[PDB]
Amino acid sequence: MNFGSQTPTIVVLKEGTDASQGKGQIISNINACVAVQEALKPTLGPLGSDILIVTSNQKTTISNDGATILKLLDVVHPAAKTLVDISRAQDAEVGDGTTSVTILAGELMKEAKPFLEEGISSHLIMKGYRKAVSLAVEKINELAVDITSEKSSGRELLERCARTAMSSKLIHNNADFFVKMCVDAVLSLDRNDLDDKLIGIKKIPGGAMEESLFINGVAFKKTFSYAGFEQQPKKFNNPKILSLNVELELKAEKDNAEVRVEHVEDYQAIVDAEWQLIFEKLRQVEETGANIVLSKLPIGDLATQFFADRNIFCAGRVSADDMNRVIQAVGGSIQSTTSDIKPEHLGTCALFEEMQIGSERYNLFQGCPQAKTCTLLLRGGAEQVIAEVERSLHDAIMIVKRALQNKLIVAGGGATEMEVSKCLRDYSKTIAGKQQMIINAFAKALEVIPRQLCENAGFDAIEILNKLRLAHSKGEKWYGVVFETENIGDNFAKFVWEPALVKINALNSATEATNLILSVDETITNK
C-alpha cells in the first residue's frame, strides 16, 4: 500500500523552528531582560556613566539615556524588545526617566524569579502587580502640591525643574548658562500649542559649548549661493522677509513644451519672451519692498542677478521643516504667486546679521519680540558631544514642556520610590494571602532606583536604606538621598523638583512590560 522504500515521520512544525515551553522558557525570557538591564544599571543617577556603542557601519554614537542606547543595538530576542518599546514610548510621551523605566521593568521580573521557582504559576503573580500599580499611582497624586498655593513666580518654576534633567549629562557643571536657554525657549512657544520641531537644534562642528547663543529668530543655513552672492550686505536693519513656494528657473523643472514656429521673425519674439516672463516675476518682488527672499525650491541665476543690484538677499533650496519654522515668526505666510503678494504678508525684525562659525555661514534673525519660535546653536570639540547635548536639551525642554500643561510638584532622586514602597507594605499586612508576598516584593522592587544612586556614588547602599526605613517610619515626604552634602535629607529644601508625568508613566510602563513577558510561557521562532 505504501509508495516505496520507507517513509520518515513528518515533523509538525517546520524544520529549523525553535520552540520550547514550560517554566524554563520564562526564566530564559527574564534573563534576556536582566542582561539588557545590566548595561543600564550604572547609567542611572547624576553620577551615571556614558556608554560607547559602535554599529556595523562604524558610526560612533554616545548616549547616556536608555532610549537611544537600545536604538543603536539591534535586538533579536523577543522579550528584550519589550524593554526597547517602553524606552521609546517614554521618550515620545515624556522623554525623562527612559532609563529608570527599564530598571523598574526588569527589577519586577527579577523579584518574580523566586516566585516562579515555587509552585505559584505566573497568572497569580500578575494579579499582585496589577493591584499594586493602581494604588501606587493614587499615592503620587496625593503627594503633589499645587504651585499656585504659594503664589510664586512662573518663571522660577520652570528653572528648578529644568536643572533636574541636566543631571547625568555634560551640562551638570555648565547648567548655569544652559538652563537659562531652554527655559526661555518654551516661553516663546504658545502655551496652547507646543512643538518639538520648532526647537530643532542644528549640529555645528567645532566651537565651545558655553559660546552658544539663544535668539528668538531662526537660521535656515545655506545651500548654494548662486552668482551675485557675497556682494550683497549680510547686515540688515529692518528687512522685509518674503518667502516663495514657486521655483524661479528658466525652463528647468517645468515639463517639456514643444514649440513650433514657422517664421524667422516670430522666432526672435519667443526668445525675448522667456526673458520677459522671468523678469516679470522679479519686478513684482521689488514693488513690494522685500529685502529678504526665501524659497523651498532652487533659485535661478537670473533671479539672484536681479537682486544683486538691489542688495536684496535671496537663498533657496531651504527644507520644508525650516520654512514652516520661519513662517511663524515672520507673521504672514508664504505666497507662491508673485502677482498675489500683498504688503501684510511680509515680515520684519529689529536686526539681521550673517556671521560665520565653524567654516559655515548662518543667517540669524534677531530682534523679534513677537516671534513664537526659537533656535539653538550648539558647539563643541567632539561631534559626539554635540549629539549628546542636543539630546540632553531635547529631554530638558520636554520637562518644561509638560510642566506648563499640568503643574505638580513630585519628589525625585529616590524620595518618591521610598515613600510609595512603605505605603504598600502597610496595605500588604492586611491581605493575608498570596498577594502579601507579591506586594512586599513589588515595594522592594521599587527600591532599585535608590540602589544605583548610592552604588554609582561610591557609598554603600546597605547603610543608606537602613537609615531610610528608620526615617520613613514617622511621616515624611520629599526625604531622599543628596549627592552634594553626602548625607540623605529633605529634597524639598534642595529645590530639586520633577514633573508628575515621569513617575506616573514609569510605574504604568514597568507593570505593563512585566506582565507581558510573564504571561508568555512558550516562545516559537520560525526560519
Binding site: 534573563n31 536582566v34 542582561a35 545590566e38 521557582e117 515555587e118 509552585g119 505559584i120 498570596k434 508576598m437 552604588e455 554603600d460 547602599a461 546597605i462 547603610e463
Partner: protein, 550 residues
C-alpha cells in the same frame, strides 16, 4: 546571562586563553551552578522524578542518586567540578543527603552573588554564613530526640523507609524495611576494644530479573556469585558442620621460576622431571582432601588436572572470585584466609583450624544464573540480598537504592539521637536564624538573613515536584515554627507544634512521629559544612584564568 563576550585588551597579554575579570566570573559561576542544580531539583523528594543518561553505546543509566548523575556528567567549567566532587564526597562519608547538599550549596551561591552586587564584601558574607552555621549546629543539638519507649526494631524500620523514598523501592519499602535492618545487624562485629562498627558493602547484592521485587528472598547468610568448575560436582551439601576451605592457592600446572634454566645430560630424566611438575601440586591437595573439606574456595582458576580428585572425593571446586568476597566467608565460618600455605616448621602441613563451619552449602539457580547460598554460619553471622526486577536496568537502580539505605541505618546505630525529616529541620533553622543577628545587626545582619532563606530551597522544591501549591505549605511551616521559638519549658502546649510538617503525599501538615519519616543527625551535620566550603571556594574567586592546552 553573559552577552557581548569581552573586549580583548592588547596591553594585557597572557599565553593561552583570555583572562576574564570582574562580575562576569561570578555570573558564570552561578550560571554553571544552576546548570547542575536544575538536574537534581526534579529528583528530590518522594514526589521527585529521576533522569536518564545515554552512554553513546546504546546503554543508559536510570538512577535517582544525585552522585551517580553528577559523576556521569564531566564538567569542563573549573568551578563546576566542585559540586560534582561534592556529591562523590557526600555519599562516600555520610551516605545520605547527596541531592540536598547540591541544592543547598547552589542556593548559597545564588543569594551570595546577589549580595556581592549589594557592595557588601564577600568575606563579610562568608563571616555571616560561618557565624550563623555555628549557632545552627547548636540548634540541631537542642532538637535531638533519643529513641525511648519503642517496640522492637520499629525505630530502625521507620528511619530506613525515609531513604527508600524517592526511589523505585519506595512503593515496596514496607517489605524491604525488614531486610535492610536485619542485614546490618548480622554483620555486627567488635573493634576498637568495645566499639561497635559495621562493614560497608558486606551485604552481597545479586541481580536476577524475574518474578517480582516483593518476592525477593533474604538469605540468612552470605551468598557468593560464581560458577562451578566441573558440572559433575554436587550442587547441594547435606548434613551439618560443612567445612569450607578459603585458599588463595590455585591448583594448576605451573612453570618454575624464570631464574631457573633446566639443563639435563640424560634422556632418562625427562620422565621424572615432567611428572614431578604435576606431583608438587598433588602434595598440597592431598592433605586437604584427607581433612574432609566439603567446599574448597580458591582465588584463582583451577585446571582440570586437580579437579579429578574433587569428583571422586565429592568435593565442590571453585574458581576465580573477588578477593574481598572470600575474606568475609572465612571470618563468618571460622576459617583463616591463607595467602600462601606454609608452617613454622620447614615441612608442609595442614591444620584443621583453617577449615570453616556452617550448616549447609547449596547452589541455587536464579533464572539462568547460578550462585552459592551459604546459610547458618558458625563463627559470625552474615546476610545477603538478591534483588529482583523486570529488567537489568531496574536492578542497577535498586543496587544504589539498597546501598543508600544501608548507609542511613549504619549512621543510625552509631548515634542514638535522630531528627525529624521531610523539611522539618530546614523550616526550623529559618526562624531560629531570623531572630538571630538581630542583636548584633550592623552590616552582618543582611548576610545572615539571606543564609536563613537559603535553606528554604529544600522545602520549596519538594512542593513543586508534587504538582501542588507550594505557597500554601510554606506559609504553614512558617506559621507553627515562628511563634513557638520563645516558649518557656513549662505549661506545655507550645513546642508540641513545629516538630512536623510538609507531607508531600497528602499535601497536609501531619505529625512526622506518627508518619515514621526520620533522618539521622549525622546526615544533617557535615552536610552544611561541606556545602559551605563549596560556597566559600567559589565565592572568593574574582578572576578565572584559562590556559590553552599544549
Amino acid at each position: 546571562m553573559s552577552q557581548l563576550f569581552n573586549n580583548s585588551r592588547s596591553d594585557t597579554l597572557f599565553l593561552g586563553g583570555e583572562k576574564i575579570s570582574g562580575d562576569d566570573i561570578r555570573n558564570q559561576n552561578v550560571l554553571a551552578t544552576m546548570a547542575v542544580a536544575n538536574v537534581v531539583k526534579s529528583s528530590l523528594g518522594p514526589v521527585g522524578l529521576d533522569k536518564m543518561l545515554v552512554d553513546d553505546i546504546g546503554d543508559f543509566t536510570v538512577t535517582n542518586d544525585g552522585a551517580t548523575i553528577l559523576s556521569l556528567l564531566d564538567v569542563q567549567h573549573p568551578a563546576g567540578k566542585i559540586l560534582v566532587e561534592l556529591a562523590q564526597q557526600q555519599d562516600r562519608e555520610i551516605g545520605d543527603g547527596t541531592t540536598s547538599v547540591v541544592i543547598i550549596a547552589s542556593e548559597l551561591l545564588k543569594r551570595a552573588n546577589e549580595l556581592v552586587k549589594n557592595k557588601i564584601h564577600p568575606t563579610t558574607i562568608i563571616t555571616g554564613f560561618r557565624v550563623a552555621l555555628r549557632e545552627a549546629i547548636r540548634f540541631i543539638n537542642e532538637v535531638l530526640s533519643t529513641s525511648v519507649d519503642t517496640l522492637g526494631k520499629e525505630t530502625l524500620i521507620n528511619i530506613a523507609k525515609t531513604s527508600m523514598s524517592s526511589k523505585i523501592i519506595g512503593a515496596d519499602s514496607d517489605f524491604f524495611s525488614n531486610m535492610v535492618v536485619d542485614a546490618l545487624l548480622a554483620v555486627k562485629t567488635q573493634n576498637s576494644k568495645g566499639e561497635i562498627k559495621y562493614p560497608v558493602k558486606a551485604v552481597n547484592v545479586l541481580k536476577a530479573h524475574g518474578k517480582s521485587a516483593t518476592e525477593s528472598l533474604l538469605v540468612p547468610g552470605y551468598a557468593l556469585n560464581c560458577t562451578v568448575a566441573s558440572q559433575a560436582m554436587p550442587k547441594r551439601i547435606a548434613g551439618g558442620n560443612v567445612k569450607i576451605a578459603c585458599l588463595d592457592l590455585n591448583l594448576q600446572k605451573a612453570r618454575m621460576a624464570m631464574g631457573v634454566q633446566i639443563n639435563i645430560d640424560d634422556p632418562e630424566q625427562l620422565e621424572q622431571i615432567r611428572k614431578r611438575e604435576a606431583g608438587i601440586v598433588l602434595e598440597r591437595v592431598k592433605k586437604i582432601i584427607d581433612a574432609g573439606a566439603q567446599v574448597v574456595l580458591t582465588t584463582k582458576g583451577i585446571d582440570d588436572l586437580c579437579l579429578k580428585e574433587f569428583v571422586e572425593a565429592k568435593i565442590m571446586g571453585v574458581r576465580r572470585c573477588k578477593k574481598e568476597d572470600l575474606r568475609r566467608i572465612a571470618r563468618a565460618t571460622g576459617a583463616t584466609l591463607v595467602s600462601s600455605m606454609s608452617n613454622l616448621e620447614g615441612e608442609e602441613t595442614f591444620e584443621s583450624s583453617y577449615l570453616g563451619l556452617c550448616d549447609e552449602v547449596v547452589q541455587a539457580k536464579f533464572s539462568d544464573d547460578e550462585c552459592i547460598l551459604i546459610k547458618g554460619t558458625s563463627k559470625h553471622s552474615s546476610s545477603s540480598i538478591i534483588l529482583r526486577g523486570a529488567n537489568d536496568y531496574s536492578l542497577d537502580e535498586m543496587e544504589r537504592s539498597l546501598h543508600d539505605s544501608l548507609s542511613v541505618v549504619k549512621r543510625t546505630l552509631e548515634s542514638g539521637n535522630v531528627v525529624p525529616g521531610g523539611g522539618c529541620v530546614e523550616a526550623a533553622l529559618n526562624i531560629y536564624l531570623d531572630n538571630f543577628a538581630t542583636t548584633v545587626g550592623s552590616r552582618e545582619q543582611l548576610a545572615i538573613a539571606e543564609f536563613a532563606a537559603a535553606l528554604l530551597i529544600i522545602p520549596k522544591t519538594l512542593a513543586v515536584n508534587a504538582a501542588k501549591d507550594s505557597s500554601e505549605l510554606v506559609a504553614k511551616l512558617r506559621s507553627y515554627h515562628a511563634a513557638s521559638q520563645m516558649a518557656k519549658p513549662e505549661d506545655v502546649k507550645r513546642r508540641s507544634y513545629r516538630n512536623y510538617g510538609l507531607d508531600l503525599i497528602r499535601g497536609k501538615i501531619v505529625d512526622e512521629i506518627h508518619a515514621g519519616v526520620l533522618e539521622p543527625t549525622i546526615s544533617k551535620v557535615k552536610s552544611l559544612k561541606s556545602a559551605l566550603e563549596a560556597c566559600v571556594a567559589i565565592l572568593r574567586i574574582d578572576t578565572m584564568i584559562t590556559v590553552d592546552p599544549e
